[PDB]
Amino acid sequence: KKERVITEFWDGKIIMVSPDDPKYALKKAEEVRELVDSELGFQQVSLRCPSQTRTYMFVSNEKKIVGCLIAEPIREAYRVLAEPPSLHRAWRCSTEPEPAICGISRIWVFALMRRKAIASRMVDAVRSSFMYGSVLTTEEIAFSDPTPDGKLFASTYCKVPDFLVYNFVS
Amino acid sequence: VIGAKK
Ligand SMILES: *C(=O)[C@H](C)SCCNC(=O)CCNC(=O)[C@H](O)C(C)(C)COP(=O)(O)OP(=O)(O)OC[C@H]1O[C@@H](n2cnc3c(N)ncnc32)[C@H](O)[C@@H]1OP(=O)(O)O
Ligand SMILES: [Mg+2]
């Protein structure tokens, strides 16, 4: 099994699965996506062809997939804004879009291994490997429809409250 | 707002 290693660490390694890898890689990528979608509480997921996506996985020293990041190409995204408080979690965004390259469609870390910089290293791996001969900046990635955990992560990782978001309608 | 998640 040829394996595409992006980065190696003392506590595991980050690998990437591309749309034109062998079937065994694409099934493992799918199994991992299924677990993530389920973890997020989806019963059914009907979307475009995964042939657009790239799947990054953080593999522990025990050969377990404990982190997963699915990236897809995007063109534009929107700065997130805090929902104004009511007089007596959600988010909004700006109306003007900004240019962006990489949209993080799903990001997940096994719960017992959270707060160990796994997600941060997966995004790092993406920023260095998504586009040939370029390292994306934090202003060139966006996150789809973030969960509360996603917001807290992205605002720290990107070092701003108004990080880029995508994958929404009106 | 609909959103590809919620
Ligand atoms: C749609 O899918 C969108 C892409 S959003 C989906 C985000 N994923 C989930 O909601 C699935 C369940 N949660 C997770 O998988 C994880 O919480 C994340 C993937 C969001 C984060 O993973 P990880 O725990 O590995 O993050 P880091 O160690 O790299 O965090 C770096 C800094 O970010 C802040 N932060 C991160 N996560 C936080 C959570 N729950 N709560 C509060 N703050 C959080 C921290 O500042 C963290 O750095 P520290 O030095 O640990 O404080
Ligand atoms: Mg902290």
Author numbering:
A (entry chain A): 523 to 610, 621 to 702
B (entry chain D): 101 to 106
Sentences from the paper on this structure:
Cohesin is loaded onto chromatin by the Scc2-Scc4 loader complex, however persistent cohesion cannot be established without the acetylation of two conserved tandem lysines on the Smc3 subunit by the Eco1 acetyltransferase (ACT). The binding site for CoA is sandwiched between the N- and C-terminal domains involving β5 and α3, while the substrate peptides binds mainly to the central β hairpin and the C-terminal domain including the conserved C-terminal extension (C extension).
To circumvent this problem, we exploited the strong binding of CoA to ACTs and synthesized two 13-residue Smc3 (residues 99–111) peptide-CoA conjugates (K105-CoA and K106-CoA) each containing an isopropionyl bridge: peptide K105-CoA is conjugated with CoA at K105 whereas peptide K106-CoA has CoA conjugated to K106. The peptide K105-CoA adopts a β turn conformation, which is readily accommodated by the substrate-binding site created by the extended loop connecting α1 to β3, the short loop connecting β6 to α3, the central β hairpin, and the C extension on the xEco2 structure. The unmodified K106 salt-bridges to D677. This mode of coordinating K106 explains why a basic residue is favoured at P + 1 in the non-directional motif consensus. The requirement for substantial conformational changes of K106 substrate binding compared to the readily accommodated K105 substrate by xEco2 may also explain why K105 acetylation is a faster and more rapid event.
